[PDB]
Amino acid sequence: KKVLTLEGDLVLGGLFPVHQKGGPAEDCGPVNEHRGIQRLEAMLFALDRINRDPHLLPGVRLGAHILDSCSKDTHALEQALDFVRASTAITGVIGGSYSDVSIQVANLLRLFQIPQISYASTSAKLSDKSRYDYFARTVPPDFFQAKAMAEILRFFNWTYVSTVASEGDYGETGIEAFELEARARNISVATSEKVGRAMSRAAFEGVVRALLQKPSARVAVLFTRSEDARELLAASQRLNASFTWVASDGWGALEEVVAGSEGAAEGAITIELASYPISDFASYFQSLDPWNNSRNPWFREFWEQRFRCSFRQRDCAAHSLRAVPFEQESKIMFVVNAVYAMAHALHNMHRALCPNTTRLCDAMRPVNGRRLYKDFVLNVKFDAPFRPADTHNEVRFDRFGDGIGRYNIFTYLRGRYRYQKVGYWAEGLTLDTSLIPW
């Protein structure tokens, strides 16, 4: 219903879960604030810096055609029909965020040779190039995440664990990979529970007692969506049930997962893909205003939900995102590098196909998608923009078009509670014991 359009010489398709998935009947629920709106603004911020970059396509302005997935694969696939209908013209696609939506969207995109780079889809399956030949990502596959989690249990001598998976490609294949890896380290799994898309608080108590039916297994491994980890922790709190949580990037270092069930979560070890905040995105997001951000068609709806106001009611104007603490979303960097990977690919494309000018020559009217994905997108290699220069971070894709298997490890501890970085994984597990009380 709402289209996000930016004019430009070339148009970059975008796909973001602006809204949450709806209730039993509605396809779209409330605005997904952090992983939705903020990740969308990250693509818009990147496109602005690129359009100001004199070293990166100074003669070709990049546009955007950003669609909302509503956190549901079938809705994203109904929306992704815009990207194919013409064949405005869509050069590539940034997104989606959730694996299921990327799989579904990739199967349609390959039929029209549309390149796609995801900034958050981690499911290992997307690494298979015979089925997903137009798919690249700035994120590593979950082969490497599940391997890393198996080493955490191997290190802390945890050999009788349990597993919790969100239904879908991410949770199932993620736990499946974890099965192989725990097996390979003498770790035996007591039981394996699966969480339905939209369970009730009664259903999660079912899962708690299901995990409890083996009291000896006090450790639980999770390949879960954040809502699921939060409802399961809430259910654990209500049922006065104490588990040792070992969780994937779904939970990550999200305050919203543990908020209200901080006691039930204390002791937990979580994983986030290795990222850093970008300060120029921070000041850009906090200076965003509903009367100046008309280019984002969902920014007013976010503003009404963020501040409990209405533009009809005239009570939105006194608020600012600067009064608020800015908790920059974890995968913001990966959105930023994914837009840059596509822009560099196209800069390299233009350099070779239009040597005589900075403008778009007939050799890129239209842009050959196959040549773009195979010869340029896959062969990008540049410094991550805005990177913490003290550490050398580089943007490229391996033989399977995946990002680098590097993860940060955290712990939820204690009045007051907080996630603390305790280690990392980058080919090997590396963590210091001095940062854990147990």
Ligand X SMILES: N[C@@]1(C(=O)O)CC2(CC2)[C@H]2[C@H](C(=O)O)[C@H]21
Annotated binding site for L-glutamate: 35, 39, 99, 120, 122, 249, 331
Exposed/middle/buried for 391, CB within 10 Å: 0-12, 13-18, 19+?
Answer: exposed
Minimum Å gap between C-beta 78 and its own copies is 6
Q: Which of 32, 51, 69, 123 binds ligand X (CB under 6 A)?
A: 123
Task: For ligand X, give the closer residue by CB, 225 or 347.
Answer: 225
Binder of residue 198, out of its own copies, ligand X, none (CB less than 5 to 8 A by kind):
its own copies
Residues annotated within the binding site are: 35, 39, 99, 120, 122, 249, 331
Binder of residue 143, out of its own copies, ligand X, none (CB less than 5 to 8 A by kind):
none
Q: Which of 22, 53, 82, 107 binds its own copies (CB under 8 A)?
A: 107
* 120 lines the binding site for ligand X (CB under 6 A): yes
Minimum Å gap between C-beta 314 and its own copies is 40
Q: Do 251 and 224 contact (CB within 8 A), yes or no?
A: yes
Minimum Å gap between C-beta 138 and its own copies is 24
By CB under 6 A, the residues from 245 to 274 that bind ligand X are 249-250
* 173 lines the binding site for ligand X (CB under 6 A): no
Beta bridge partners, 409, equal: 271, 423
* 108 lines the binding site for its own copies (CB under 8 A): yes
Residue 76 identity: A
Q: Which of 117, 77, 119 is nearest to 97 (CA)?
A: 119
The CB-based long-range contact list for 320-327 (8 Å cut-off, 24+ gap) reads 320/286, 320/289, 321/285, 321/286, 321/287, 321/288, 322/286, 322/287, 324/286, 326/282, 326/285, 326/286, 327/34, 327/255
* 122 lines the binding site for ligand X (CB under 6 A): yes
Cα–Cα distances in angstroms (integers) from residue 434 to residues 33, 73, 87, 265, 422, in the given order:
35, 43, 58, 20, 8
Binder of residue 331, out of ligand X, its own copies, none (CB less than 5 to 8 A by kind):
ligand X
Q: Which of 197, 209, 214, 359 binds its own copies (CB under 8 A)?
A: 197
Taking CB under 6 A as the rule, which mask of x and - marks residues 285-324 in contact with ligand X? ----------------------------------------
* 342 lines the binding site for ligand X (CB under 6 A): no
Cα torsion angle, 53, 57, 58, 61, sign: negative
Torsion of CA 386, 147, 39, 258, to 10 degrees: -110
Q: Do 139 and 118 contact (CB within 8 A), yes or no?
A: yes
* 77 lines the binding site for its own copies (CB under 8 A): yes
* 170 lines the binding site for ligand X (CB under 6 A): yes
Q: Which of 104, 244, 270, 393 binds its own copies (CB under 8 A)?
A: 104
CA distance 84 to 67: 13
* 337 lines the binding site for ligand X (CB under 6 A): no
Q: Which of 241, 244, 270 is nearest to 257 (CA)?
A: 270
* 210 lines the binding site for its own copies (CB under 8 A): no
Q: Could you tell me the maximum CA-CA distance found in the chain, to the nearest angstrom?
A: 72
Task: For ligand X, give the closer residue by CB, 169 or 301.
Answer: 169
* 230 lines the binding site for ligand X (CB under 6 A): no
Tokens read off for 114: 């549309």
Can the peptide bond before residue 267 be classed as cis, meaning omega within 30 degrees of 0?
no
Binder of residue 110, out of its own copies, ligand X, none (CB less than 5 to 8 A by kind):
its own copies
Binder of residue 302, out of ligand X, its own copies, none (CB less than 5 to 8 A by kind):
none
Binder of residue 81, out of its own copies, ligand X, none (CB less than 5 to 8 A by kind):
its own copies
Tokens read off for 73: 């694969």
- Number of other CB atoms surrounding residue 309 within 10 Å: 17
Tokens read off for 51: 């359009």
Binder of residue 97, out of its own copies, ligand X, none (CB less than 5 to 8 A by kind):
ligand X
Q: Which of 158, 146, 114 is nearest to 133 (CA)?
A: 114
Angle at Cα 346 formed by Cα 341 and Cα 352, nearest 5°?
Answer: 130
* 97 lines the binding site for ligand X (CB under 6 A): yes
Task: For ligand X, give the closer residue by CB, 65 or 225.
Answer: 225
Cα–Cα distances in angstroms (integers) from residue 271 to residues 109, 268, 392, 435, in the given order:
31, 10, 21, 15
- Number of other CB atoms surrounding residue 172 within 10 Å: 17
- For its own copies (CB under 8 A), the number of binding residues is 14
> What φ, ψ does residue 49 adopt, rounded to 5°?
-70, -35
Q: Which positions touch ligand X (CB under 6 A)?
A: 35, 97-99, 120-123, 170, 225-226, 249-250, 331
Q: Which residues bind its own copies (CB under 8 A)?
A: 73-74, 77-78, 81, 104, 107-108, 110-111, 130-131, 197-198
